[PDB]
Every structure is written in C-alpha cells, then in structure tokens.
Amino acid sequence: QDNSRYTHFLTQHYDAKPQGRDDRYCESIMRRRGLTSPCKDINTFIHGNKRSIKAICENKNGNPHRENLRISKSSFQVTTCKLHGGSPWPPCQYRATAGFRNVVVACENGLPVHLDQSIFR
C-alpha cells in the first residue's frame, strides 16, 4: 500500500527547490528533517521533481547496479551536507557541497527506499 521507506527516503534525501545551498542551508534542513540527534555524519539531498527520481527504478532513468542497487541515467542537482567538529551532538555544523551528477538508489515496488551515500564521500 503505502511505503514508509519511500516516505523516509523523501524526508532524508529530497528537497524540491532549496534556493541557496550553502552551509546554513544544510544546518537548517538537517535539523528540520530530524537528522540532528545524533548529527548524521553525511547526508545528501536531491533537488527537482520526484518523477525523475522514481524513474531510476525503471529502465526509463535507471540501470541495475552492483549487488541490488540502481544508478540513474540523468544527472541531478544535489547538496551534500557533511559534519565537521568531531562531536556527534547538536549544535550540528555542516559544510555544504552542491553537486550535479547521477545518483545511486535502491528501489522497492518502483519506489526509492535508499540513497547510496558513498558516491558523495
């Protein structure tokens, strides 16, 4: 029916139109999306519409990749938020890295349920 994992994916990895994707963007959205207790070490948000991202799950915008993942054909505007300061607890200071590249996800039932973070490390 519903997919709580696709819902979690959106919360953790999707931001439709961010505007300025600087450090303070990261600090605000990381707190907003509930990722600051403890501070998530690295988290990347995808921008634009959701139908492009879903389409990574189909032949449309994706290919099978590695053990059980999928890799997009199209590039996406992304913003990676990376923790600095060696303390895992708030306040969480983030460095933003805007990117434009293809993304790796895992899908269930045609829906993204996981973002592979490693390609942004």
UniProtKB/Swiss-Prot annotation:
Q: What is the effect of changing V103I?
A: In ALS9; uncertain significance
Q: What is the effect of changing D22G?
A: In ALS9; homodimerization is similar to wild-type; localization in the nucleus is similar to the wild-type; strongly reduces ribonucleolytic activity
Q: Which GO terms describe its cellular component?
A: actin cytoskeleton; angiogenin-PRI complex; basement membrane; chromosome; cytoplasm; cytoplasmic stress granule; cytosol; endocytic vesicle
Where are the catalytic residues?
H13 (proton acceptor), H114 (proton donor)
Q: Primary place of residence? A: secreted
What Enzyme Commission number(s) does the record list for this chain? 3.1.27.-
Outcome when changing H13A:
Abolished ribonuclease activity. does not affect binding to PLXNB2 receptor
Q: Where in the cell is it found?
A: Secreted; Nucleus; Nucleus, Nucleolus; Cytoplasm, Stress granule
Outcome when changing I46V: In ALS9; uncertain significance; reduced ribonucleolytic activity; moderate reduction of thermal stability
Identify the tissues in which this protein is expressed: Expressed predominantly in the liver. Also detected in endothelial cells and spinal cord neurons.
Question: What intrachain disulfides are recorded?
Answer: C26-C81, C39-C92, C57-C107
Q: How is its activity regulated?
A: Has weak tRNA ribonuclease activity by itself due to partial autoinhibition by its C-terminus (residues 140-147), which folds into a short alpha-helix that partially occludes the substrate-binding site. In absence of stress, the ribonuclease activity is inhibited by RNH1 in the cytoplasm. In response to stress, dissociates from RNH1 in the cytoplasm and associates with cytoplasmic ribosomes with vacant A-sites: ribosomes directly activate the tRNA ribonuclease activity of ANG by refolding the C-terminal alpha-helix.
| Outcome, altering K54R | Found in a patient with Parkinson disease; uncertain significance
Residues that, per the record, bind tRNA: R21, D22, C81, V103
What one GO molecular function would you report for this record? ribosome binding
Q: Which residues carry this modification: Pyrrolidone carboxylic acid?
A: Q1
Indicate the impact reported for H13R: Found in a patient with Parkinson disease; uncertain significance
Span(s) of short sequence motif Nucleolar localization signal: 31-35
Q: Which UniProt keywords apply?
A: Amyotrophic lateral sclerosis, Angiogenesis, Cytoplasm, Developmental protein, Differentiation, Disease variant, Disulfide bond, DNA-binding, Endonuclease, Hydrolase, Neurodegeneration, Nuclease, Nucleus, Protein synthesis inhibitor, Pyrrolidone carboxylic acid, Secreted, Signal, Stress response
Query: What GO biological process terms are annotated to this protein in UniProt?
Result: actin filament polymerization; angiogenesis; antibacterial humoral response; antimicrobial humoral immune response mediated by antimicrobial peptide; cell communication; cell migration; defense response to Gram-positive bacterium; hematopoietic stem cell proliferation
Question: What mutagenesis or variant effect is reported for N68D?
Answer: Abolished binding to PLXNB2 receptor
Per UniProt, what does mutating R5A do? Answer: Affects substrate preference. Significantly decreases binding affinity for RNH1
Q: Which domain of life is it from?
A: Eukaryota
Q: How is this protein organized at the quaternary level?
A: Homodimer. Interacts with RNH1; inhibiting ANG ribonuclease activity. Interacts with PCNA.
Functional summary from the UniProt entry: Secreted ribonuclease that can either promote or restrict cell proliferation of target cells, depending on the context. Endocytosed in target cells via its receptor PLXNB2 and translocates to the cytoplasm or nucleus. Under stress conditions, localizes to the cytoplasm and promotes the assembly of stress granules (SGs): specifically cleaves a subset of tRNAs within anticodon loops to produce tRNA-derived stress-induced fragments (tiRNAs), resulting in translation repression and inhibition of cell proliferation. tiRNas also prevent formation of apoptosome, thereby promoting cell survival.
What is the name attached to this protein's record? Angiogenin
Organism, as annotated: Homo sapiens
Q: Which gene encodes it?
A: ANG
